[PDB]
């Protein structure tokens, strides 16, 4: 009876095994664009992904992760609300069974078709496992996906998904360039929050970009063909792997832009 996204193990159950689910700095949240405060003290984000080394793609039974080599400062995020250098370790997505839902973060209650998370950890803690125990240990870049035109830079990801259909499968995935997933503008909202899957630790500085990227109906259809289950256990399509919005409680969302 492991956690997941179904009727009987889904987000409304998670608190029984992970009491921090009802904590004071849980994610995701709804971003109220009229209540977000412009903070002109926020620096622009610095994304240096020109030396990124992707290694592998895998289906971990709740999403697919593309993993990067994080043994040196090769793909890093700096600037913005962050002190220090945060290394990219993996990215993944959350998506829906239909185009009108899928994202974790919402903007004035609007859901997008999917949400990309680029996960980075604070190099001062030395590894990822130590970073998740600290309040400033991780920085996640969140990017919304809407359905429209195809994103060429995602097609390489879509094409290998057939080879990792079921839980526990992996495949070599070298020379993928994550710069092909970024929108044009780097304006962002930021707030302190949590992992959105168990263990839901409150170690994340969230940076959510204002500008969505567009993907095609056909691209996102291919995400929906993946499986939560292992080979060949009964087929359960990996859809709606998103956590609903949580109470903002005592936090302020800040914007880098007016
Ligand atoms: Zn995520």
UniProtKB/Swiss-Prot annotation:
Changing residue 119 to K/R: Strongly reduced CO(2) hydrase and p-nitrophenyl acetate esterase activities. Changing residue 62 to G: Impaired activity, not rescued by 4-methylimidazole (4-MI). Zn(2+) binds at residues 92, 94, 117. Changing residue 5 to H: Reduced proton transfer rate. CDD domains: alpha_CA_I_II_III_XIII. Zinc. Can also use cobalt(II) with lower efficiency, but not copper(II), nickel(II) and manganese(II). Changing residue 60 to T: Reduced activity. It comes from the Eukaryota. Residues 1-257 form the Alpha-carbonic anhydrase domain. Changing residue 119 to A/G/I/L/S: Reduced CO(2) hydrase and p-nitrophenyl acetate esterase activities. It is found in: Cytoplasm; Cell membrane. InterPro entries: CA_dom, CA_dom_sf, Carbonic_anhydrase_a-class, Carbonic_anhydrase_a-class_CS. GO terms for molecular function: arylesterase activity; carbonate dehydratase activity; cyanamide hydratase activity; zinc ion binding. Interacts with SLC4A4. Interaction with SLC4A7 regulates SLC4A7 transporter activity. Interacts with SLC26A6 isoform 4 (via C-terminus cytoplasmic domain). Catalyzes the reversible hydration of carbon dioxide. Can also hydrate cyanamide to urea. Stimulates the chloride-bicarbonate exchange activity of SLC26A6. Essential for bone resorption and osteoclast differentiation. Involved in the regulation of fluid secretion into the anterior chamber of the eye. Contributes to intracellular pH regulation in the duodenal upper villous epithelium during proton-coupled peptide absorption. It is linked to Osteopetrosis, autosomal recessive 3: A rare genetic disease characterized by abnormally dense bone, due to defective resorption of immature bone. Osteopetrosis occurs in two forms: a severe autosomal recessive form occurring in utero, infancy, or childhood, and a benign autosomal dominant form occurring in adolescence or adulthood. Recessive osteopetrosis commonly manifests in early infancy with macrocephaly, feeding difficulties, evolving blindness and deafness, bone marrow failure, severe anemia, and hepatosplenomegaly. Target of drugs used in treatments against glaucoma disorder and breast cancer. This is Carbonic anhydrase 2. The lineage of its organism: Eukaryota, Metazoa, Chordata, Craniata, Vertebrata.
């Amino acid at each position: 009876h492991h956690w997941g996204y179904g009727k009987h193990n889904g987000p409304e159950h998670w608190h029984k095994d992970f009491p921090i689910a009802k904590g004071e700095r849980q994610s995701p949240v709804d971003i109220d664009t009229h209540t977000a405060k412009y903070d002109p003290s926020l620096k622009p984000l610095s994304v240096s992904y020109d030396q990124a080394t992707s290694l592998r793609i895998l289906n971990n039974g709740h999403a697919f992760n593309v993993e990067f080599d994080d043994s040196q400062d090769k793909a890093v995020l700096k600037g913005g609300p962050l002190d220090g250098t945060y290394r990219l370790i993996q990215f993944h997505f959350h998506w829906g069974s239909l185009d009108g839902q899928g994202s974790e973060h919402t903007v004035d209650k609007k859901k997008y078709a999917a949400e990309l998370h680029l996960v980075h950890w604070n190099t001062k803690y030395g590894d990822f496992g130590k970073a998740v125990q600290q309040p400033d240990g991780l920085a996640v870049l969140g990017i919304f996906l809407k359905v429209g035109s195809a994103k060429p830079g995602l097609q390489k990801v879509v094409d290998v998904l057939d080879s990792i259909k079921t839980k526990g499968k992996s495949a070599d995935f070298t020379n993928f360039d994550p710069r092909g997933l970024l929108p044009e503008s780097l304006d962002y909202w930021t707030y302190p929050g949590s992992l959105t899957t168990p263990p839901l630790l409150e170690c994340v500085t969230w940076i959510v970009l204002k500008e969505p990227i567009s993907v095609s109906s056909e691209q996102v259809l291919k995400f929906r063909k993946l499986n939560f289950n292992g080979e060949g256990e009964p087929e359960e399509l990996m859809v709606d792997n998103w956590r609903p919005a949580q109470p903002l409680k005592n936090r302020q969302i800040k914007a880098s832009f007016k």
